[model samples]
Target: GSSGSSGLLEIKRKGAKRGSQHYSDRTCARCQESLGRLSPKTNTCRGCNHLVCRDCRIQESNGTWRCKVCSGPSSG
Candidate 1:
């Protein structure tokens, strides 16, 4: 049944869509850099809002399940 369904999925989906929009809009999460059509996915550090490239995020999962935003030792 749908009893176990979660709103988080919807929120995440919407966030992904927002990322796509940002990509298409040529906006970067950091530095307000105008990457034009070359702008890639919109991945941001939720804690500090530090903008990171997709490749950079891979290392974020290191040792911990926490995301880059939440994984930073200095992060809350």
Candidate 2:
């Protein structure tokens, strides 16, 4: 999606169609930072089961990565 955010903060929320709870949010589970298409994509950490932010994640194969905390201890 096209991006143009206010440096101030998240300028908006997902579709404001109604008050119903949105199924998902782009905010990072670790640092609570909302991700954008311009920013690094997030991946759910298998260990903690939280949508880990890109800044705190590592790659396992060519496909996806996980939270850094999951791989912080040592290599497998």
Candidate 3:
């Protein structure tokens, strides 16, 4: 059974491959900031599948990453 709650943004990759490497056009759902392909700060929310930037996401004490929307008061 599924809750049928799909509140996440879809990720799309666009751009030419440079030197045998490719890049993505995925932007942050919260800040709307463009995420560089090699950016270590780029993160994807597991609960909502939303793409978020470093400023919009947080790392839990258990080493799990979550977005602001899913990391609310009821979050684990």
Candidate 4:
């Protein structure tokens, strides 16, 4: 007999990048880095609900996407 863990197999959908909700604070949800001196528009991943920076998140087929953290098997 084979054993397997069937958890959150498939769930794909749309996405977007939100603006600064608070202020004077922002970072990547994956790499955990500041918005940087240059600048980067941060996003709010509906998966983990964190500051998912552009470099961290993915650009879906359309125009939206999810971050690497919640993009894969991260709900463990």
- The number of the candidate with the highest lDDT is 3
lDDT of 3 by residue, 2-72 (tens): 56554668776645454544435777887788786635344877768778887777788767877787775
Model 1 clashing residue pairs (backbone): none
Ranking by TM-score: 3, 4, 2, 1
Q: Model 1 — TM-score against the truth? A: 0.25
**Model 4 ranges off by over 4 Å:** 1-24, 36-42
Candidate 3 stretches greater than 4 Å from native? 1-24, 37-42, 73-76
Q: 1-76 in candidate 4: lDDT tens per residue?
A: 8877765667664444565556566667678787666244537765566676777776766566788866755655
Which residue pairs overlap in candidate 4's backbone? none
- With candidate 4 superimposed using the best TM-score fit, by how many Å does residue 22's alpha carbon deviate from the native? 9.2
User: What C-alpha RMSD separates each model from the true structure?
Assistant: 13.4, 16.0, 14.4, 16.4
Q: What Cα-based lDDT does every candidate model obtain?
A: 0.44, 0.67, 0.70, 0.66
Clashing pairs in 2: none
Local error of candidate 3 at residue 41 (angstroms): 10
lDDT by residue for model 1 (1-76), tens: 4556545433334444434533444344434565454434445544445554443343433432223444544533
Residue 44 local lDDT, model 2: 69
What is the C-alpha lDDT profile of model 2 across 1-76, one tens digit per residue?
Answer: 6977555555676666877775656767668786755344336676677765778777787675677767677555
Q: In candidate 4, how many Å is residue 11 off? A: 46
lDDT of 3 at 36: 67
- lDDT, residue 18, candidate 4: 60
